[PDB]
Design an enzyme around this catalytic site. Structure first.
Site, PDB file in Angstrom:
ATOM      1  N   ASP A 133       0.825  -1.251   0.000  1.00 15.06           N
ATOM      2  CA  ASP A 133       0.000   0.000   0.000  1.00 15.06           C
ATOM      3  C   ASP A 133       0.850   1.289   0.000  1.00 15.06           C
ATOM      4  OD1 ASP A 133      -2.559   1.300  -0.370  1.00 15.06           O
ATOM      5  OD2 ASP A 133      -2.660   1.505   1.860  1.00 15.06           O
ATOM      6  N   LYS A 135       2.045   4.834  -0.955  1.00 15.48           N
ATOM      7  CA  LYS A 135       1.356   6.028  -1.476  1.00 15.48           C
ATOM      8  C   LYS A 135       1.689   7.234  -0.607  1.00 15.48           C
ATOM      9  CE  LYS A 135      -3.273   5.471   0.535  1.00 15.48           C
ATOM     10  NZ  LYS A 135      -4.598   4.951   0.097  1.00 15.48           N
ATOM     11  N   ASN A 138       0.522   7.468   3.172  1.00 11.78           N
ATOM     12  CA  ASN A 138       1.139   6.553   4.145  1.00 11.78           C
ATOM     13  C   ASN A 138       2.600   6.896   4.402  1.00 11.78           C
ATOM     14  OD1 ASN A 138      -1.307   5.300   4.149  1.00 11.78           O
ATOM     15  ND2 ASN A 138      -0.685   3.372   3.292  1.00 11.78           N
TER      16      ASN A 138
HETATM   17 MN   LIG Z   1      -4.405   5.621   6.432  1.00 11.52          MN
END
Ligand SMILES: [Mn+2]
Ligand SMILES: [Mn+2]
Lengths: 322, 10
Positions: A133, A135, A138
């Site tokens: 994840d 991005k 984050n």
């Molecule tokens: Mn989050």
């Protein structure tokens, strides 16, 4: 063995409302130290089927130690709630910063990229974790301006030199072609994610964009990458390597993984041991007066004031050493 | 500035 409760903390400020709970700037009474506490209602986790992602996040945070991964200090539960007491990143999300500035210089993107690569090299090689994840949202900054990765609920544990995964998951704008193809995919999905974050940092836009997720996915699968005419040739060679659609051609796609990216001429002169020891100069230092200054967190949340059931999660609780 | 995104899991 240090059992903790909600009573051992003061609750200072809402940092952000998540999908399944909230994140609160807290102060540990016994030590004076500040943390970000993530508080989830058990009722919600169970009803939205978030239990598996919650437990993965607990496990990856317990089993990881790295200067560019957010540290877990405690996890505990109440009858009511699950609680993660985490390292507070005063700098807010790189998403905040890139929204204000539009682009980062190649030198500033190189710094963030070197700290992301060190974190992901650790996760893949030392922990057999694929993050999946990556991005801007984050990628947080600490008070000194070093990277802190947050949100580990989408990780896969136990992935080795070549082993494969099936779960369709991530953030639509960041999905690698092999994930959208819905075949098995390996750890190289993280390197596609690096390419997309680094492209955004240096180019001020996603490499592929459409508001509609289905057309966005046809661009990610079919369109050839382009670059702004000002981008340096080392930047362009790195992004072209990272954003190869075939994972076996991707920079970092082979058995050497992160070491292939570390060898790339865009990082020439970076001493990876020095990256890890935080010896390099952050090119942006958050201008936070004190630890309760939340200028890099969005207005919707910092403003909201709340000043201070369901099952038992077996063996959820944890306390860091030292 | 693109809009903020959310993850998903199927
Ligand atoms: Mn989050
Ligand atoms: Mn979207």
């Amino acid at each position: 063995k240090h059992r903790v409760t909600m009573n051992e903390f003061e609750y200072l400020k809402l940092l952000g409302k998540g999908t399944f709970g909230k994140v609160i700037l807290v102060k540990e009474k016994a030590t004076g130290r500040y943390y970000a506490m993530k508080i989830l209602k058990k009722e919600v986790i169970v009803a939205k089927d978030e239990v598996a992602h919650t437990l993965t996040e607990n496990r990856v945070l317990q089993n990881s130690r790295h200067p560019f991964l957010t540290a877990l200090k405690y996890s505990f539960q109440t009858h009511d709630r699950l609680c993660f007491v985490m390292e507070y990143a005063n700098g807010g999300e790189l998403f905040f910063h890139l929204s204000r500035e539009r682009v980062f210089s190649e030198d500033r993107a190189r710094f963030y990229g070197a700290e992301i690569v060190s974190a992901l090299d650790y996760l893949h090689s030392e922990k057999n974790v694929v993050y999946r994840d990556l991005k801007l949202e984050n990628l947080m900054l600490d008070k000194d301006g070093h990277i802190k990765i947050t949100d580990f609920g989408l990780c896969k544990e136990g992935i080795k030199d070549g082993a494969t995964m099936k779960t369709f998951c991530g953030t639509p704008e960041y999905l690698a072609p092999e994930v959208l193809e819905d075949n098995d995919y390996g750890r190289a999905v993280d390197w596609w994610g690096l390419g997309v974050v680094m492209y955004e940092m240096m180019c001020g836009r996603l490499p592929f964009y459409n508001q509609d997720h289905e057309k966005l996915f046809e661009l990610i699968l079919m369109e050839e990458i382009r670059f702004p005419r000002t981008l340096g040739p080392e930047a362009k060679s790195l992004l072209s390597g990272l954003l190869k659609k075939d994972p076996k051609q991707r920079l970092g796609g082979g058995s050497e993984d992160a070491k292939e990216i570390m060898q790339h001429r865009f990082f020439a002169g970076i001493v990876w041991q020095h990256v890890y020891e935080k010896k390099l100069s952050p090119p942006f230092k958050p201008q936070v007066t004190s630890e309760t200054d939340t200028r890099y967190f969005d207005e919707e949340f910092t403003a909201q004031m709340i000043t201070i059931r369901r099952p038992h999660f077996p063996q959820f609780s944890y306390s860091a050493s030292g | 500035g693109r809009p903020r995104t959310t993850x998903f899991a199927e």
